[PDB]
Amino acid sequence: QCVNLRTRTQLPPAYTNSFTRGVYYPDKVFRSSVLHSTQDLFLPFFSNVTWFHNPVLPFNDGVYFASTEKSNIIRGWIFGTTLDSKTQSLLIVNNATNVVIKVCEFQFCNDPFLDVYESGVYSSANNCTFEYVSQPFLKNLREFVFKNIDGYFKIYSKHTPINLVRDLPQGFSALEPLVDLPIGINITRFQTLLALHRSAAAYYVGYLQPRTFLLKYNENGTITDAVDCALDPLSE
């Protein structure tokens, strides 16, 4: 059911400034009107992140994914190491009703995509271990953070009503935790899933590195400001 197309999906791989996006709650502890310094993996301020306008990309320590989505074209993600049945493959799809997460040794095609008239991008589904169904994640800006530590997969998310033309706006917004997975995999690469009908896709990708941040909690316990300490001397 999966066959290669004629034209290459050559999306322009440009660069864009990160500004001050990609801050999430590091724990589940309530703090009121206090400044707290924490050392963890983050996305450094004012970095140059990659912009696509669908190859295989390395996973590294963590991944920050952003989509200036209109009409919900982006549908899912694929994670793994060998991207076949020889190693565990993680699959996430948010279809029309609910999100489905699978951990199985699938057999994907060269260029998987969702297809419309369910999941047929895999030619086999054997030795399944973990299954999960939950509420759907999704002119909007959708931000997600994917991390994998000691057999635990952490997904944080945030939705924003945006009206800017092209790039990420100059603003600050923390990312609340969304989902945890108690599954042990050693993912090294990933992919993006599009529901393209048989008959112009832009997103932003950034990586994470360890560093120290300073966060401010207001009286209600919401993160409102942050400072990167491994930067210009004033910030330090």
Binding site: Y25, K28, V29, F30, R31, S32, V34, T129, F130, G151, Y152, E176, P177, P182, I183, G184, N220, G221, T222
Partner: protein, 364 residues
Amino acid sequence: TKCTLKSFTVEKGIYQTSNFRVQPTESIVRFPNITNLCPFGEVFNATRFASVYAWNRKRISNCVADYSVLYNSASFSTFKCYGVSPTKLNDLCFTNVYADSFVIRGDEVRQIAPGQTGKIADYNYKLPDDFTGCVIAWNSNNLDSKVGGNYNYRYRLFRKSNLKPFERDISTEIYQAGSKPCNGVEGFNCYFPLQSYGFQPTNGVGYQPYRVVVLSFELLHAPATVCGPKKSTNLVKNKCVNFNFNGLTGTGVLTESNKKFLPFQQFGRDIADTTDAVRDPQTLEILDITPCSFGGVSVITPGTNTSNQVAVLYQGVNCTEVPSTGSNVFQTRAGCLIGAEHVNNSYECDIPIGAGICASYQSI
């Protein structure tokens, strides 16, 4: 006072003797409403159980399993837990469970055990000597046995080699007993490895069918997901008690709080990393923790020469939990004071107490 001062006479003044702290009364535990019970109903109470050489395999992961209800069940003839004690199986647990279910004769139940060999133990199913888990078997003569002949159940009888641990054989190759090859048809030296069982409602004890399910618990480095619940209990308030709220342990008094937790945090700390507020896993409300009171004690004496009646001051302790009656009790900004009277006059200060007040001897 004489003990601390190490003398048989005491000069007039105020001295510090010992400390005082409110002891905890009882302990409480909190845990969520529980969910995702493990589905043993469709395994042990299954309508049909496969053959011994083709035992049904079921995977158990990501649920909660109460072993007390099956432990107390008397409907099972044999319940042997070898790797671990049956009672403590509710606490200790492994990352996954494998259930192997089949039916055998009553005389063959002993073969299904570590360090056991036999026709069933070597031709149909093999159990390793290092196996950890449990085996639960019960008679099924009233169900599995058939009046017309329960020939649906088959057991493997012929194989050159034995069975590996946790190995299932479903091959129906015509076994060759001798050196004479057979072209798919059983001959003098060729016989069918599978023999059909002859269960009947009245066939004797030992020959009757018996449903046996073996649960093997495996603890691969993946996180453990299936074992017994945590027994919660009710909560109390306005009492210095010790608690283990969802694994977070601490001692103090619990009160109602007006703090507004954001919908995903569980507990809070103000500064210097000291927990103040927690969220109960069942009611989902924010509480407040305060360490129960403590402080030093002091004795006011007019000197051994003058008299031998003293007064007792508890520092920074509210006049609510003194123990115990003595004399009239006074509550001051410095704490509580027993054994002395309060007057409206004003003299010079002899034995300073604090907060602008002090006491003397007249009584004290």
